[PDB]
Structure formats: C-alpha cells, structure tokens
Structure 1
Amino acid sequence: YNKIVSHLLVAEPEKIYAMPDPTVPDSDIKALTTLCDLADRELVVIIGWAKHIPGFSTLSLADQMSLLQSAWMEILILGVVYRSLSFEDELVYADDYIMDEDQSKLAGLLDLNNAILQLVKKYKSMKLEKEEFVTLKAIALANSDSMHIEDVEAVQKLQDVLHEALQDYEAGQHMEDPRRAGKMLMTLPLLRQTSTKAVQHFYNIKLEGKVPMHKLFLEMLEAK
C-alpha cells in the first residue's frame, strides 16, 4: 500500500516498561508518579520518532518544538488507546502497568480514564488497524493547532502529505467503505477533547506539588 504508511510502520518505536517501584506502597501518589515517569520517557521516544515523519526535520527547530508541545498529550493518549484495543475496560499504559476501574479510582483518574475508554470503544467498533493508528498519530502532530508556527505553509504541507497517505491507504485497502478516511479523521475531536482535559488535570497535579515530575514532562506541561 501507501509508502508513507509503510514508513511510519517501520518507524514505530519499541514499547517501554513502566517499572512501578516494587518497594513503594501502592497509593495515588505512587500511581501518578509511575504514570508521569512513564510519560517522561515516552516523550523522549516521541521526539526521536518524529524525525522519521517526512518533512518534519526540515521545519525550523522552533516549529518542530511548537508542534510537539501542542500535540504530545494526544500522541501519548493515542498510544495507550491502541495498546488497549484487545482488552476490556482496562488501559494498557505498559505491559507491566494495566489499569482497571478500581485502580483508576484509586489514582483519581476515573473520569479521565473513562474518556480514554470511550476512545478505545469507538476504535474497537471501527476495527482500527496499526496502519491507521500510526498515520493518525502523525496527523495529530501536524494538526495540533499551535498558535506559534513560523512557516504555516510548510506545516500545512505536512498535514497534506499525511492526510493524502490516509486517503490513499483507505482507498486501496477499504474500498467497501468510501468514507473510512473521513470517519478516522472524525475521531480526532474526541482525542483532542480528552487530551485537553488531561493537560488541565495533570497541570493541577503539578501545582499541588505532591507528585514529583521529571524535566521534559514538566517542560511539555508548562508549554501546553
């Protein structure tokens, strides 16, 4: 099929482990600390992954940073959503960190994780493919609506290249549904809605100062 899709598939990063501290008693602080630690390490991986998206590394460093600072939460959330598609009412943050409803309650994340579960449910019904997941991640980066872009036409070209990839993929692989590309694009509002609420929630956790957070996660949170 489409070459951009095949390229994004081979550029997909390896999974990483959450490694919750086995000496620490389970608590809301432990869960939130584990999750923000995992996110910090995933952000390093996301920055490296974006260099593989066609045209991304030719943007100015400022525009690269603006896109990543706008899109990082959507990219992280799309990841856990995809990892969770074969599960029922559980979120696979990592192979060693799967959250059920009780754990979400304990961490203070019941409402936020339930919105992520709504995303999972919709993609399950659509039978979201890995090809579509990696293309949507890249589209979410290009379409992230930063207010600080220098070269707007170059970012629009990036959007166009990835959108065309999705169009072409669906036209060749899903002829039974001539609206599947658009259906995939119409899942992005709920992703943006959930990411908006997640950023607000974890910014409040940052302000409360009870959960330690690493440098990169704080930089992305403070920018966003």
Structure 2
Amino acid sequence: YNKIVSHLLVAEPEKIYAMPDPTVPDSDIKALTTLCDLADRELVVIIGWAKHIPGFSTLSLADQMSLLQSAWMEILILGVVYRSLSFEDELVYADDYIMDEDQSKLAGLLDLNNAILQLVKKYKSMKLEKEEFVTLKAIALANSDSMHIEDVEAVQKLQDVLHEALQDYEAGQHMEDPRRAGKMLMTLPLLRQTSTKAVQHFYNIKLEGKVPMHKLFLEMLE
C-alpha cells in the first residue's frame, strides 16, 4: 500500500458540524451565514492539513500561501462532494446541514449546487474511494495554477510526487482498469470549473468580508 496515501488518510481532519442558528428564521441570509461560518472553520483545518503533505512546508511561505489562495475553494468543494456520495440529489455540507433542491433555491445556490451534484454524479459512477479522494485533494492543492509561484520547479516536484502516489495506488488496487489514475485526473477540470464559478459568486455577493483572504492565510500560516 502506498505510504503517501496512508499518510494522507491519517492527516484527514475530523468532521465539523455546521450548527445553523436555531433562533434565526430560515432565509437566504441564514443559509449563506451558515456556509460562511462553516467554511471559515474548514479553512483553518485545511491550512493545518496542508502542512502534512510531503514537501509542502519546505516551499516558501509565499508559495504555500499562493497554492492555498488558488486551491481553497476546490478543496472545500471536493469535501462536500465526497460527503455526499451516498446521498441522492442532496449535498452534505455537514452532518447537520444537508441541502436539498428546495434549500438551494432558497439560498440562491441552485446553479452552483447543481454543478456540485454533477461532480457527485461522476464520482458515484466511478466509485470514488476515500484513498482517491484524499489524494485528489492534495493534487488539487499542488496543481492549482497560481500565477504567482516563486519556485515553479519545486511546485512541479510536489505535483509529481502526488501524481506518482495516485498512479501507484491505482496500479496496486485497480488492476482491472490500468487507466483509472488518468480517469481520476480527468475529473479535475469539472472541479476547477465549479470552483471558478463558486469564487465568482462569492465575490459577486461580497462574502469575503472586511479583511482580505490573503491576510487570512498569512495569519494562519505564520
């Protein structure tokens, strides 16, 4: 069994409850608040998680920040996708916050949650395993295509190392499909597309708040 995959499995953060405020009337604002508060907590643990990825900490702080800046929404989305694989037309943002179509409509997230469900659909068909999920999260971080990378070569080595882990996993676990690793890689474009739209929506409705995201990753990394 592949050691990087094993390591990523033990580095996996614990479940986080959303705790929607039971005193607040249901509304689009309440849904967005709940999601913002959930994501902020998730981002803190994502930063800690990334430090476990072999080679990530040896990048400059600027490069670590750049990768995180570019990847954070993909990592959040891949999480909700994975959590939702055993459900039907619903998204498990947390065990206590499962969004059906009516809820998504109410939150103004129909189009976005429908795209996320498209990711779910594909991964259900492919029978996405936890091992594959955690490896793809790490790959999405390393492959996030920041336009501000200092050490392009080191970031490529990190991509290489993680891709190798996925290939080695699939070679051992899935001999019935010698192309499964590539199929997994071919799911990344839809994740990127969905993230891109989610981030556009995030800025369009001003969820970023008073303090820029750049400084937030700084505080947490420094």
Q: Deviations over 1:117-167 (max 9, x none)?
A: 000000000000000000000000000000000011000000000000000
RMSD in angstroms over aligned alpha carbons?
A: 3.0
CA contact (8 A) 1:69 1:220 kept: no
Distance of aligned partners of 1:75 and 1:3 in 2 relative to their CA distance in 1, 3 Å threshold: same
Q: 1:206 to 1:119 in 2, by over 3 A?
A: same
Structure 2 CA distance for partners of 1:216 and 1:185, relative to 1, 3 Å: same
**Distance across 2 between alignment mates of 1:8 and 1:99:** 28
Mapped to 2, the partners of 1:148 and 1:208 lie a distance apart of 21
Determine the C-alpha separation between the residues in 2 that align with 1:123 and 1:144.
20
> Which residue in the other structure is 2:189 paired with?
189
Instruction: Show CA shifts across 1:51-93 (max 9, x none).
Output: 0000000000000000000000000000000000000000000
8 Å CA contact retained: 2:83, 2:93 = yes
% same residue: 100
CA contact (8 A) 1:5 1:169 kept: yes
Distance 2:107 2:41 in 1: 20
Task: Give unmatched runs, 5+ long, in structure 2.
Answer: none
CA distance in 2, matches of 1:131, 1:195: 22
Alignment pair present for 1:116 and 2:113: no
TM-score (norm 2): 0.94
Match of 1:15 in 2: 15
Single out whichever of 33-42 and 210-219 deviates more from structure 2: 210-219
Matched residue of 2:106: which SS? helix
* Contact residue 2 and residue 169 of structure 1 kept, 8 A: yes
Which residue does 1:54 correspond to in 2? 54
8 Å Cα contact 1:29/1:210 also seen in 2: no
Counting only pairs closer than 5 Å after superposition, residues 100-179 of structure 1 correspond to structure 2 as: 100-179=100-179
Q: How many residues align structurally?
A: 222
Once the 2 structures are TM-superposed, how far is the Cα of residue 205 of structure 1 from its aligned partner? Answer: 1.1
| Equivalent pair of 1:29/1:211 in contact (CA under 8 Å) | no
List gaps (5 residues or longer) in structure 1: none
* Offset at residue 216 of structure 1 (A): 3.9
Q: 1:209 to 1:201 in 2, by over 3 A?
A: same
